[PDB]
């Protein structure tokens, strides 16, 4: 079982700003990495899926990078509508798994 | 177990995969993993076709040229011209089959990925026609060395422009496949002009007994019908989504490559055996 | 457009079972493959497993392979998940989610959740 973990868990940053989080796997997943967003009580949207495909329709501040068993989600410049919750997954293991989440707070 | 993935339709691939709309089902996701790519050569899809032709076409001229390259030295005028001659006709050969049944593999990886390896297989078709005039144009005017060289000259200019337009990335659309038939397809029909040169500098009765006057008209049947295939999707084009696995045009014209350049090989064979044998001597 | 229009919410008791429905519309429903996702209240996302309508197969995750049973009906383009023996640990948000060949999820449904309570 492939596990992944999310370093920033709680993020809090300002409108404009750079923000990242990493997703480290355990075993390589040789890029089979999607990004979603989450808002209150909604189902998730995805924004970046192979590592750094950015999905249709999300902004190009949403950016995604890494290779092997480290990957990133970097936003250019913070909104203050980009506040809820961002998940990574893998999908080469045959379980697949979720991060453990970070919530985003703008202030 | 791991790296697990389906099909998918026309029309949830990207803009980078979209190269016939006439092959309506059976396409490979996007997976950017090398390992995958190479793990679909036992799965069927759009291009497994594509892949095996070239796969095992590469193995036929593998063998055919370190057997040619490994014929003992004893049997030649000169070894050493003889089999670099040779040689060219080969390494262009191998280039070619090799950059194309890897383009085929590694083109559902990623967009970089597959606009490097879709250069490379264009670049190799180039390799290939370039390697072919080296020992067609050797033993052919092998007393007139003045054409031989000028018509290397115009094969390499020649070629070497059709491999800086094949780096270019308009050049690969969908929009230009015409434009890619007639660019190979006039680089076959510069050889138009030392066939006839061959034809009134010996006798027109040798042309046809010896060597091969069918040479030329396999040849170019196979020029002019792999072009025509490839720019216009013969047999998807009837019916899309009838050929989305096999029998498509770009597969048809994958084993007419094969074909001509084994008919090419054929063919120069028996025109050096032409060259160091008697009423085949120089003359004035 | 794709949509996937999911059962309402469920409240039962606990030691009973239930059923939640995808209702697939906009695409072939063949074509690709339906995962299901738990997600407890103030926790994280977790995979149950995914399905294969064209070829029936279905592949679980051990930690529900003894909760969830696949079903589908093809002749109306639905999906359907069956949670046995509830209790209080299976209190969560499922959703469906659609591959597109590879298991990246571009489409979800809104989601269904089940309430295990005893007040
Ligand atoms: C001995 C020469 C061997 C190579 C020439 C024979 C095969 C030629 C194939 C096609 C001729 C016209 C080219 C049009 C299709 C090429 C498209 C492509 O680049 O893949
Ligand atoms: C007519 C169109 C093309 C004719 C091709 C004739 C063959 C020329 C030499 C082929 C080769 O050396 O690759
Ligand atoms: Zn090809």
């Known amino acids: ?107 | 177990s791991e790296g697990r993935w389906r099909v998918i339709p026309y029309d949830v691939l990207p803009d980078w995969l979209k190269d016939n709309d006439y092959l309506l089902h059976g396409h490979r996701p996007p997976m950017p993993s090398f390992r995958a790519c190479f793990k679909s050569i036992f799965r069927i899809h759009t291009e497994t076709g594509n892949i095996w032709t070239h796969l095992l076409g590469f193995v036929l001229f593998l063998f055919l040229g370190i057997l040619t390259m490994l014929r003992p030295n004893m049997y030649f005028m000169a070894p050493l011209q003889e089999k670099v001659v040779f040689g060219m006709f080969f390494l262009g050969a191998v280039l070619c089959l090799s950059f194309s049944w890897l383009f085929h593999t590694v083109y559902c990886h990623s967009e970089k990925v597959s606009r490097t390896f879709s250069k490379l297989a264009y670049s190799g078709i180039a390799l290939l026609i370039m390697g072919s005039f080296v020992p067609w144009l050797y033993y052919s005017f092998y007393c007139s060395p003045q054409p031989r060289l000028i018509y290397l000259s115009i094969v390499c200019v020649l070629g070497i422009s059709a491999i800086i337009v094949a780096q270019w990335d308009r050049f690969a659309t969908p929009k230009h496949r015409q434009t890619r038939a007639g660019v190979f397809l006039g680089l076959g029909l510069s050889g138009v002009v030392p066939t006839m040169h061959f034809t009134i500098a010996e006798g027109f009765v040798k042309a046809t007994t010896v060597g091969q006057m069918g040479w030329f008209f396999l040849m170019a049947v196979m020029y002019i019908t792999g072009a025509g295939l490839y720019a216009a999707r013969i047999p998807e084009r009837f019916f899309p989504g009838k050929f989305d696995i096999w029998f498509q045009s770009h597969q048809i014209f994958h084993v007419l490559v094969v074909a001509a350049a084994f008919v090419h090989f054929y063919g120069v064979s028996n025109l050096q055996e032409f060259r160091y044998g008697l009423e085949g001597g120089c003359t004035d | 457009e794709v949509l996937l229009q999911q059962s309402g919410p469920e409240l039962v008791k606990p030691g009973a079972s239930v059923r939640i429905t995808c209702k697939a519309s906009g695409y072939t429903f063949t074509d690709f493959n339906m995962d299901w996702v738990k997600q407890s209240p103030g926790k994280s996302l977790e995979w149950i497993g995914d399905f294969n309508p064209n070829s029936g197969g279905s592949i679980y995750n051990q930690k529900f392979k003894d909760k969830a049973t696949f079903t589908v009906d093809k002749s109306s383009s639905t999906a359907y998940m069956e949670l046995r023996s509830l209790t209080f640990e299976d209190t969560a948000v499922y959703y469906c989610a659609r591959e597109t060949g590879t298991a990246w999820f571009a489409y979800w449904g809104q989601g269904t959740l089940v309430t295990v309570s005893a007040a």
């Open chain 1, 1 to 107: 079982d492939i596990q992944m973990t999310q370093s920033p868990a709680s993020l809090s940053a300002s409108v404009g700003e750079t923000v990242t989080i990493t997703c480290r796997a355990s075993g390589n997943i040789h890029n089979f990495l999607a990004w979603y967003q989450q808002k209150q009580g909604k189902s998730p949207q995805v924004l970046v899926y192979n590592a750094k495909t950015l999905a249709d329709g999300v902004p190009s501040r949403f950016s995604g990078s890494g290779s092997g068993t480290q990957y990133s989600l970097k936003i250019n410049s913070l909104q203050p509508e980009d506040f809820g919750s961002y998940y990574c997954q893998q999908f080469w293991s045959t379980p697949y798994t979720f991060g453990g989440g970070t919530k985003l707070e703008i202030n």
